[PDB]
Amino acid sequence: REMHGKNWSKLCKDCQVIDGRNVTVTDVDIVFSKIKG
Amino acid sequence: REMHGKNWSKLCKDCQVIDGRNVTVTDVDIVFSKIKG
Amino acid sequence: REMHGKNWSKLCKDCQVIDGRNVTVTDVDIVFSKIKG
């Protein structure tokens, strides 16, 4: 709940990422899904 | 709930990202979905 | 709820992003969706 990230960093919570230089997604139904109740 | 990110950083909460230099998405049904109740 | 991001940063909450230099999206049904109840 207190995130402190200095030069050139990366942090997350509950995150979903596809980090990276050359990214390619093809021929997909769904990429990100969430549900609650 | 208190995020402190100095020069050249990245932080998130509940985030969903596709970070990156050359990004390509093709032939997709859905890319981001959320539901609550 | 208190986000403090100095020079050249990125932060978010509940965010959904497609950050990146060369971005291309093609032949898609939906890109961003949300629902509540």
Next chain:
Amino acid sequence: REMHGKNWSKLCKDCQVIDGRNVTVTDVDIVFSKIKG
């Protein structure tokens, strides 16, 4: 030297092609080059 191609065809000589439905080229120096002497 005599090419006869009926409905819905493709033919070539000395050809260089990038045929196709969804085409994407990115971050390239050269795509087509020829030299003679």
Next chain:
Amino acid sequence: REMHGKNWSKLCKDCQVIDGRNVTVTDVDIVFSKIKG
């Protein structure tokens, strides 16, 4: 030297192709080169 290709065909000579539905080229120096003397 006499090519006869009926409906829905493909033929070539000396050809160089990248046929196909979803085509992606990225981060390349050269894609097609020829030299003679």
Next chain:
Amino acid sequence: REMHGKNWSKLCKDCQVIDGRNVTVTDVDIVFSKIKG
């Protein structure tokens, strides 16, 4: 020198191809080269 290819075919001579549905090329120096003398 006489190529006869009916519906839904493929033929070539001296050809160089990358046929196929989902094609991806990445981080390449050269893809096609020829030399003569």
